Design a protein around this ligand. Structure first.
Ligand SMILES: [Mg+2]
Length: 257
């Protein structure tokens, strides 16, 4: 496992669509969602950004290449850290983007060490999301900026969907899942000043069934990486999300001080 569910080589993030008429490729939608978080992180070249829960490293590399920032990405998954470092080295950005171990609930950085923090589909992994947000506030310089993307629960689910929601949370490591208002309350309680909050559930949910389709199509080649059961839970995770409409998606921007 439970503590490690949803992390590793299969840790793929969602994408942004303009309704069910967009027909963009999954990669295009994924880049589009990334660019929306970049728009909410007002840092410039040579500023230093902490990527909390780096996935397999792709948004951090896009972020460094677009804004010219230095990026330190962290995760508890050694697999994710190795994949991400190899991607950075292959892209010739290892001098600008690096990945190392850290638990977001106990960040190994001194106070006020970052100009910005980036958390894309990662804070739901924290059993104590508030402690993680307080750690983010601590390592941000005064005036430092924060850009979050995460799942939110939009309201109660049908009784018939309680089982599906439980499986989505168990298999994806969704240890913290709240509504938008509670999320904003924790951001304030952590000492951060919210600057914007956006429910983009309608743009992102279309990517759920599309990502399920992409992973099932990859079964033959992905089995060595995930294993039989690992591949099963990964495909199930996106299928469950696509069947429970109360699994939403939100963007949050905040600043310290
Ligand atoms: Mg994930």
């Amino acid at each position: 496992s439970d503590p490690f569910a949803g992390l590793g080589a299969g840790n793929i993030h969602l994408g942004y669509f303009d309704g069910p008429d967009d027909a963009a490729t999954l990669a295009e939608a994924a880049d589009r969602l990334t660019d929306q978080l970049i728009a909410r992180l007002p840092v410039v070249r040579d500023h230093r950004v902490l990527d909390v829960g780096c996935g397999v490293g792709k948004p951090a590399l896009r972020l460094a290449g677009d804004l010219g920032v230095r990026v330190v990405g962290v995760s508890i998954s050694e697999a994710q850290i190795g994949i991400a470092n190899e991607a950075a080295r292959a892209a010739g950005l290892a001098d600008r983007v690096s990945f190392r171990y850290a638990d977001a609930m106990r960040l190994p950085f001194p106070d006020a060490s970052f100009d910005g923090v980036w958390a894309m589909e990662s804070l739901h992994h924290m059993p104590d999301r508030l402690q993680a947000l307080r750690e983010i506030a601590r390592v941000l310089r005064h005036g430092g900026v924060l850009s979050i993307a995460d799942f939110v629960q939009l309201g109660p689910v049908r009784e018939q969907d309680e089982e599906a929601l439980r499986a989505f949370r168990s298999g994806g490591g969704v240890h913290t899942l709240t509504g938008i208002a509670e999320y904003e309350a924790e951001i304030a309680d952590a000492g951060l000043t919210l600057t914007s909050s956006s429910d983009i559930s309608a743009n992102v949910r279309p990517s759920m069934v599309r990502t399920a389709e992409a992973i099932r199509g990859a079964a033959d080649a992905f089995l060595p990486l995930m294993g039989e059961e690992g591949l099963r839970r990964l495909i199930d995770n996106f299928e469950r999300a696509a069947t429970v409409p109360q699994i939403g998606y939100a963007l949050f921007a905040a600043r310290r001080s």
